[PDB]
């Protein structure tokens with residue numbers, strides 16, 4: 001792919017984070033803490049899952065960024081509507097305003113309803129995410145395997161501004177403590 005030139009500098013929005021997340025001072029990394037991080041509650045925070053949004057909002061254009069997932073056992077990545085539900089239980093699906101892929105239990109899925117099996121021969125250490133707002137496209141690339149395509153959501157109905165979306169995943173196993181990191185341009 002030749003999407004690298006639409007690169008955007010993404011930073012994480014502390015105010016949207018689940019209360020157990022630790023966002024770095026540069027707002028480029030996030031990890032699961034072992035306890036509540038001593039923040040006040042607010043209506044923006046994801047309550048049920050270790051989720052956070054990027055600060056940037058996109059309503060036009062082509063955007064590309066990369067995320068480091070090295071040594072993680074579980075995570076979700078993609079984009080979502082600015083108006084997604086924050087509280088309680090919900091599915092990551094386009095009907096609920098999410099365009100995402102996951103790792104869980106040694107398999108990769110796309111967040112369709114129902115979910116779609118992904119075919120990845122080289123487990124990725126970095127994921128590239130491409131959004132074409134006007135075309136209604138969200139695509140995922142395997143940076144570890146020369147940029148190979150992972151998955152394309154097409155005919156997307158965004159229906160609002162989009163935000164970068166992250167889930168660091170739970171760490172019940174003690175093997176999923178590693179952070180998500182936004183990779184340099």
Ligand SMILES: Cc1cc(N2CCNCC2)nc(C)n1
Pocket residue numbers: 049074075076092102103104167169
């Ligand atoms: C990586 C991951 C897993 C997950 N589930 C929750 C329901 N049971 C199956 C596992 N949910 C999310 C949002 N992310």
